[PDB]
Design a protein around this ligand. Structure first.
Ligand code: CYC
Ligand code: CYC
Ligand code: CYC
Ligand code: CYC
Ligand code: CYC
Ligand code: CYC
Ligand code: CYC
Ligand code: CYC
Ligand code: CYC
Lengths: 26, 159, 161, 66, 191, 161, 160, 160, 161, 161, 160
């Protein structure tokens, strides 16, 4: 079921938005 | 394990174990208690290692978790985390065995084929393992950390 | 093949479980035994030829097998029999270090009965020879080691029969 | 092409070998048809016995596709 | 005064591993032996076959223990990668040298040995020549059905120890299998 | 193996008969179908990887099989399963060109059930995967081609079960 | 057949059929209708072809039909004609297949060994096939005859 | 080439060329003139094909032409176009040869390994070739386009 | 090997040039010749044994070579010589179809002179035998074919000498 | 092959001398270096792919060699070149652990120059690529390790040239 | 040595050294200092070890030092002691190397054949080595003696 992953993953998506960062060469 | 490897070489040469082979077994069994401790620490902190490494990975590669990206969507994101958890469990097995035989059969041979079909990018799975190393290493004593590091590095090499 | 450590790992991997304290305890048990096993193995390797000679004297030689019309009659057959004895001893030693009987099944035991039947090698006598080796080995290794050593010899004997 | 499945048991009567020879001694295997006649002869000269022969692939008495 | 690594030397022994596939064996054990087959018979110096070189159906039958190592080696020689890399670029006398090296582990023993195999190649296939060496008595004594072929430097026949050193140690392959896009001599330095 | 043209010749040769009009009609039938088959085969080859991916998504993945304790758990086993899928697809395509199911029997089908049973590969799931591939293929090839394609996929499925 | 051969080469390479290999299949299926017509013509004229070829062969080789020769006597002469008929039937099968694979299994492998036991001379047999070709060519259209010729030539090549 | 392949198989079997093999050579030489025309068309339109294909590829995959991506930067973008041009040249050689043998030795063997070192994504490359096919097909006649398609398809299949 | 078509391609590929009209003209030239070559090849294959017999009669047999003390004395050596003749004929036929001499260089010509010198085979006589075959072949193939056929025979002869 | 420890032993064995304090000092020297070498070897193995990529970028690629006509032109040749680079790197790592260059002479350097010359592989560029790898490796391993690592890379380069 | 053995296994696998294999190397380098001390002790006491072991061997087997026996006579007795000294030297080399590879190449390969020509009885030789172990053990510390024992045992195993 990956239930722990399902709740943790949405928690992660809500806390931070990846759709702006853009890749950094670093 | 160390045992399996030693025995297999001896059997192939149809001989009893060398003094060198015996010595390696002795050293390994002395290290056993320490190895079990390292594994236990990582097992306990599993959820943290995966999650913090996951966060770093998503920061490092925003694209994967983007509408265009493969990992996009919560279900997909969960699967990527599930994968990280699987790889962490494998590492612990390696540490207690003292070799990669368990790791290799379960997680690296045929790995190229599977991810390529899925279209998940491997030139990034390795990065996730690197990430996991950094987190895991911070929960270990310096000597313990080095031991653990080797196994993490092997995974990165194998991909 | 499989060893004690890998056997625990494999059992947990099919469950998908991370390694737990109960599992750790089984692993820990092997690690204490290990030092003793290594000492036993060195004893056996050094005395291997003697062990086989004593065991043959106890069971195989001075018998009908050695006498004409017996399976161990002719130099070629005598030599083959003591070669097989050496195999059994070597593999039992490997199993004792490993702490697992799997290697015996994978290499020694697999196909042995069928081969023996075609050859005409008598299984009962072979088993007798293995049991004889065990007793001799028991003496050399010492009591603590002997218990561990005995189970692998017994495993071979049961497989053959 | 036709293929045979063959079981055989072969003894070493000229020499005594230390390395484990069990895989050579009892060997079920798949043999191309064109190779079998040579492989049978070989087992017979060694004083092995051919326990079983079955035609795995191919049809009996087929004029073409053989 | 002479040292332990003077005549034959310590290295060539101990660089020789007998491999036998066992049905029970773990995949990691099996795959080390399979890789050794590829590296002896196709001359994969790096020791890990590129995927295009692999043959998968044969590998699956080998991992299933439906075929022997000997029968796998026979299939490899009848393969198209064998024919393109080793038969087509070479001349028949060199083709025979490469056959003995690849299967058998040694240089050709005699000009009489060379002539028999050349007559096979000319009158019947490459495959018929591959079938002959594997069927040969030499093949069956040294490797039988279980052992993967190895480099063996014999010494029993006269001249064979030298020859087998020259073919296994100095005759690295020096021709390109492919005909297309020949390299121009110049452009040696990188500027 | 045997193709449609050779199969007719095969049947006439055992009779010893020269080729006759009825025989010629069967040959004629194949020759009209041929162009369609060639087109279908090219479609399948180009989309082969996708076909396997879609079929796995439909049946194999996100399932208990992929989860620990399942036959498709571990990378090694996952890779083996998709390799088998590829085999089935390739052989079905060969059969469709040939117009004969014989090749499937000779190379894929013979011994497969027994092998699968010893391995513990689940036949029902495999059949399901073949059926899934057929549906995907049917779309790509188009209707006329699909009928021809379907019979070979069905032949594989029936053989396995 | 052409189909069998293409599939077999692909299977050895463990690959799906190459563009070139597919093209060869396409060409063959277009040719097929013409091939069937050529085969039908030969089948109809078979009795005549065999008879005429026999005569020419006996003209070419008096020895075979002589007391020493194998063909001598009615039964033997019939058998020699029967053989010619067999080879003609094989040729027809070959034309429709577009390849000699069918012909080769039935007629060309072991042919030397069979004839050697019988003591029939193989070169004479080849001459009989050549004879058959000449008769067959006359009945066939020039373009058709060329196609048919190849298959006849293969036979002659295979036993020589 | 068709020729090379046929000869090579015969040499390995140590036989003269089969009737079927000879027929396939005849077909190829007949088709040759058509093939040359198809190749010429693509050569003339090459600059356009590469450009149009490039655009489609970049539209389909933003990432390659992005800071993270391999193609990012002018030099890198040029190299990605250069690669596409190389693959088009290979395809033209393939069409005249009638086989992928030319294509395969120059471009498909070792391609994975080369790209993996460079870190270029192989699936993107495949997309670019697919793109090139679509453009090329439009320039070619329908019958010509089908022939050309096979060679393009082979490339796409190999780069996977 | 490399055929005529691939030889053109190779020249352009090292330059990096796409195929051009001048290149296309060379390819076009080959395609007209092609049909003739195929016909010639079939003629040679059917008459191969005869061609060798006639050529041997012209040069090799009834000579000192066949008589005792000669390189083609003894059945073993006679048979080897006719085997070589057959190889030359077969490879020349392959070269004629290909339209390129490369195959001859790669397999037949490479190391042949050196081998012959160690064996003691006389090169001059061999060359003579090749030239004899050419003349016989020329007759069978017919004039248009003969010109093409001749160059490959000449190429072999020059290489050997 | 020979390693540092065995090299001392071999020198004493030809003399027939038992090991003495001076000999022991050389052995002691190796044992202090050893820990560093092990760490360096692990670094190199993990970063092996990267090392080769960087080294190729520095010397081999963006060059005439990669452009048509060049040895590293064509995918097949590019892949061969990076294959060889990986071999050299792996053996250098083995030499560094061993503390002796012997292994390089035996497996790596044997017949290499002559083979390269026949192939047309450019030696100078290869040497350049080895030197490039060394620089990259030097950075990863760190300074103490780098000195040890450098000598083995230099040994390879000198051999090739 | 340990190093040599590890490299050889890696070469066969065609792989870089595994984490486990690296760990084994680490353990060996740590042990090295202790090993050197053990070897030095035995080197100093060599003359005594050989002499005492010889005496024990001659007590165990009167025959070897008897007219029938090979060791009989002064020269022969010296040679038998010389051999024991050679084996002791090899053992010291083995201890520092951490493996029997040094021992094995110099002393255990072809040993049967050499002794058989000489006609020396192999089991007696083994007894002499056992004797040497007992003397050596007494001089060594208990932990040191165990380490030394393995190498002595290997010799006894190799020739018996
Ligand atoms: C995370 C690093 C990347 C990512 C994640 C992702 N994973 C999957 C799906 C699968 N993961 C596995 C893999 C394993 N199964 C095993 O047995 C093992 C070894 C123990 C592993 C590693 C499986 C089988 C799947 C397939 C589906 C399933 O789990 O049943 C997905 C889904 C695949 C898809 O295409 O939908 C995803 C997205 N994606 C990224 O981009 C990360 C780099
Ligand atoms: C006498 C010349 C020397 C001698 C002999 C000796 N032999 C044994 C014991 C056995 N001898 C054999 C031999 C054979 N079995 C066969 O099949 C053949 C070939 C046909 C032979 C030659 C066997 C099998 C035995 C084992 C006992 C048994 O037969 O059951 C001994 C006894 C010693 C012991 O048992 O340890 C002896 C003394 N010994 C010498 O020293 C003489 C020079
Ligand atoms: C001795 C206690 C008894 C005895 C033995 C005997 N064995 C053979 C022949 C063979 N023995 C084996 C067995 C093995 N080979 C293996 O690889 C393994 C597993 C590691 C085993 C245990 C085999 C395969 C053979 C055949 C060929 C060979 O020599 O290896 C013989 C000879 C029989 C013959 O005629 O060949 C004998 C005598 N027989 C007795 O009577 C004793 C009780
Ligand atoms: C003994 C009188 C002298 C001696 C001999 C010696 N030879 C070798 C090594 C080899 N010997 C040969 C020789 C032959 N092989 C043949 O086929 C023939 C003809 C029938 C001969 C005579 C070979 C090829 C080898 C090398 C391979 C092998 O060991 O089988 C050595 C040992 C070299 C080594 O490193 O092992 C020695 C010592 N040397 C002396 O000191 C004597 C004067
Ligand atoms: C996938 C749909 C299902 C699945 C497959 C699966 N197969 C194996 C192992 C084997 N597969 C075969 C089958 C073939 N080999 C061939 O050559 C052919 C004909 C061309 C076939 C179809 C074989 C022989 C094996 C055994 C040995 C080998 O690995 O080659 C496995 C792996 C089992 C293992 O642990 O090795 C699997 C997973 N199983 C599933 O879960 C799917 C339902
Ligand atoms: C474009 C579709 C994709 C892309 C391409 C890309 N390629 C490079 C660099 C190189 N590409 C090649 C390839 C070839 N050499 C050959 O011989 C052949 C076959 C004829 C090919 C196709 C080579 C050799 C290079 C290396 C540089 C050089 O030419 O010397 C790059 C640049 C990467 C770098 O860091 O150099 C790129 C970007 N990349 C993508 O992501 C596109 C999808
Ligand atoms: C007589 C029993 C049959 C017969 C004979 C015949 N022979 C030839 C020609 C040749 N014969 C040989 C044979 C040999 N050369 C050797 O070295 C040996 C072994 C020592 C032998 C037997 C050779 C070399 C020739 C070729 C010509 C030459 O001598 O240089 C012919 C002529 C062949 C032709 O067709 O012109 C004949 C007739 N033929 C029969 O009919 C008898 C049954
Ligand atoms: C016949 C015209 C002349 C003749 C020939 C002859 N050749 C040999 C021996 C060899 N011939 C070759 C040549 C080839 N082998 C090949 O496969 C090819 C390329 C396809 C060629 C052209 C070779 C390599 C040999 C050596 C091994 C072998 O026999 O195959 C002999 C035998 C000489 C001997 O003593 O061995 C002969 C007689 N010699 C003549 O007299 C004619 C002028
Ligand atoms: C890379 C820096 C340069 C380069 C390499 C390159 N090598 C080849 C071909 C071969 N490489 C070897 C080398 C070895 N074989 C061995 O046995 C060993 C030592 C044990 C080595 C190191 C061999 C023998 C070959 C030939 C066959 C093969 O590929 O296995 C090529 C390809 C040559 C060809 O034409 O195919 C290349 C490109 N070349 C460069 O340009 C770089 C400077």
């Amino acid at each position: 079921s990956l239930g722990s992953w399902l709740d943790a993953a949405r928690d992660l998506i809500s806390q931070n938005d990846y759709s702006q960062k853009a890749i950094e060469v670093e | 394990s160390v045992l399996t490897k030693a025995i297999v070489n001896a059997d192939a040469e149809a001989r009893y174990l060398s003094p060198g082979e015996l010595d390696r077994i002795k050293s390994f069994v002395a290290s056993g208690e320490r190895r079990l401790r390292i594994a236990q620490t990582l097992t306990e902190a599993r959820e943290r290692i995966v999650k913090q490494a996951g966060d770093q990975l998503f920061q490092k590669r925003p694209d994967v978790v983007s509408p265009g990206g493969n990992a996009y969507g919560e279900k997909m994101t969960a699967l990527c985390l599930r994968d990280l958890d699987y790889y962490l469990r494998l590492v612990t097995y390696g540490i207690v065995a003292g070799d990669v035989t368990p790791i290799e059969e379960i997680g690296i041979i045929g790995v190229k084929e599977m991810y390529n079909s899925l279209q998940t990018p491997i030139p990034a799975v390795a990065e996730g393992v690197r990430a996991m190393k950094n987190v895991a290493t911070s929960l270990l004593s310096g000597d313990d950390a080095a031991e653990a590091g080797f196994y993490f590095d092997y995974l990165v090499g194998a991909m | 093949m499989q060893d004690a450590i890998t056997a625990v790992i494999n059992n947990y991997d099919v469950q998908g479980k991370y390694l737990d304290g109960a599992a750790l305890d089984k692993l820990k048990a092997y690690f204490t035994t290990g030092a003793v096993r290594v000492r036993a193995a060195a004893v056996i390797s050094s005395n291997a030829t003697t062990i086989i000679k004593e065991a043959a004297a106890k069971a195989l030689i001075y018998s009908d097998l050695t006498r004409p019309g017996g399976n161990m009659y002719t130099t070629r057959r005598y030599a083959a029999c003591i070669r097989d004895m050496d195999y059994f001893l070597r593999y039992a030693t490997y199993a004792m270090l490993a702490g697992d009987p799997s290697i015996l099944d994978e290499r020694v035991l697999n196909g042995l009965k069928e081969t023996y039947n075609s050859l005409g090698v008598p299984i009962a006598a072979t088993v007798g020879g293995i049991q004889a080796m065990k007793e001799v080995v028991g003496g050399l290794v010492g009591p603590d080691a002997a218990k561990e050593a005995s189970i692998y010899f017994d495993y071979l004997s049961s497989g053959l029969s | 092409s036709r293929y045979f499945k063959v079981t055989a048991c072969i003894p070493s009567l000229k020499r005594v070998r230390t390395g484990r020879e069990l895989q050579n001694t009892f060997f079920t295997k798949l043999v191309p048809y064109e190779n079998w006649f040579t492989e049978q002869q070989r087992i017979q000269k060694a004083g092995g016995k051919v326990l079983s022969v079955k035609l795995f692939t191919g049809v009996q008495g087929a004029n073409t596709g053989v | 005064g002479q040292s332990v690594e003077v005549g034959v030397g310590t290295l060539r022994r101990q660089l020789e591993h007998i491999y036998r596939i066992a049905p029970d064996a773990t995949r990691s054990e099996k795959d080390v032996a399979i890789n050794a087959i590829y590296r002896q018979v196709l001359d994969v110096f790096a020791g890990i076959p590129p995927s295009y070189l692999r043959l998968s159906e044969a590998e699956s039958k080998l991992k299933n223990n439906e075929i022997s190592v000997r029968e796998f080696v026979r299939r490899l020689g009848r393969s198209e990668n064998y024919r393109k890399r080793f038969f087509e670029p070479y001349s028949s006398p060199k083709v025979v040298e490469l056959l003995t090296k690849h299967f058998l582990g040694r240089a050709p023993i005699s000009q009489q040995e060379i002539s028999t195999y050349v007559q096979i190649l000319g009158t019947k296939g490459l495959a018929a020549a591959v079938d002959a060496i594997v069927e040969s008595p030499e093949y069956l004594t040294i490797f039988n059905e279980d052992i993967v072929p190895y480099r063996r430097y014999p010494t029993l026949p006269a001249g064979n120890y030298r020859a087998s050193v020259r073919v296994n140690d100095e005759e690295l392959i020096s021709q390109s299998w492919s005909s297309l896009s020949p390299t121009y001599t110049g452009y040696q330095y990188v500027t």
